[PDB]
Design an enzyme around this catalytic site. Structure first.
Site, mmCIF file in Angstrom:
data_model
loop_
_atom_site.group_PDB
_atom_site.id
_atom_site.type_symbol
_atom_site.label_atom_id
_atom_site.label_comp_id
_atom_site.label_asym_id
_atom_site.label_seq_id
_atom_site.Cartn_x
_atom_site.Cartn_y
_atom_site.Cartn_z
ATOM 1 N N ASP A 1 39.584 39.932 37.709
ATOM 2 C CA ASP A 1 39.994 41.302 37.493
ATOM 3 C C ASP A 1 41.066 41.615 38.533
ATOM 4 O OD1 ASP A 1 39.879 44.107 36.789
ATOM 5 O OD2 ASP A 1 38.580 44.360 38.543
ATOM 6 N N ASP B 1 42.874 45.370 39.521
ATOM 7 C CA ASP B 1 42.589 46.587 40.282
ATOM 8 C C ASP B 1 41.127 46.625 40.726
ATOM 9 O OD1 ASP B 1 45.218 48.169 39.743
ATOM 10 O OD2 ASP B 1 44.514 47.615 37.744
HETATM 11 CA CA LIG Z 1 38.781 46.766 37.873
#
Ligand SMILES: [Ca+2]
Ligand SMILES: [Zn+2]
Length: 182
Positions: free
Chosen positions: A8, A10
């Site tokens: 992932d 952010d």
């Molecule tokens: Ca995230």
């Protein structure tokens, strides 16, 4: 087939300020770059899989996302972290931007991005990890039959549902190499 660390973005690689699309707002979380470098040394492919609904929302363009992603790619490569793949989903069912307004196969928790990477890089999913700060990350991993689902605390105050779905909970992606060594 090669094992991979699916990542992932952010809240896992960069600090999640919400709809991050500017270089001067992209802030690498402490220790993640060194961690990724070590993960490469340990023989893992590294593959970013990231929802970017801000594109569909009109918060920023795909052009802007490419500019930032290119910059991210160089910064990492220049620190001897060479990402094997970068996948993103710019979609949202309620997108204000027509081109991207749709349901899709690639928005987590759909496993689409992970499946595309799997087919492309010939990845050993059972021997792989997924790292994220949200439930959608854990669910995406589950669907794509990723061996180990790792939740991190560097982004969203983790929900009990996300926590439930996860195999491990680590403070940070920075801690992953030691956890795997052990
Ligand atoms: Ca995230
Ligand atoms: Zn999508």
């Amino acid at each position: 087939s090669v094992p991979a660390i699916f990542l992932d973005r952010d809240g896992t690689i960069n600090v999640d300020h919400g709809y991050v699309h500017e270089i001067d707002n992209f802030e690498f979380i402490d220790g993640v770059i060194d961690a990724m470098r070590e993960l490469k040394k340990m023989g893992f492919a590294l593959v970013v899989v990231t929802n970017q609904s801000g594109i569909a929302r009109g918060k920023f363009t795909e052009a802007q996302f490419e500019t930032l992603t290119e910059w991210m790619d160089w910064s990492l490569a220049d620190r001897d972290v060479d990402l094997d793949g970068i996948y993103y989903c710019p979609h949202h069912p309620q997108g204000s931007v027509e081109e991207f307004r749709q349901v899709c196969d690639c928005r987590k928790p759909h496993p689409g991005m992970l499946l595309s990477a799997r087919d492309y890089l010939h990845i050993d999913m059972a021997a792989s990890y997924m790292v994220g700060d949200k439930l959608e990350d854990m669910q995406a991993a589950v669907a794509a039959n990723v061996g180990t689902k790792v939740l991190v605390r560097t982004g969203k105050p983790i929900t009990p549902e996300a926590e439930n779905a996860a195999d491990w909970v680590l403070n940070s992606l920075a801690d992953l190499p030691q956890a795997i060594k052990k």
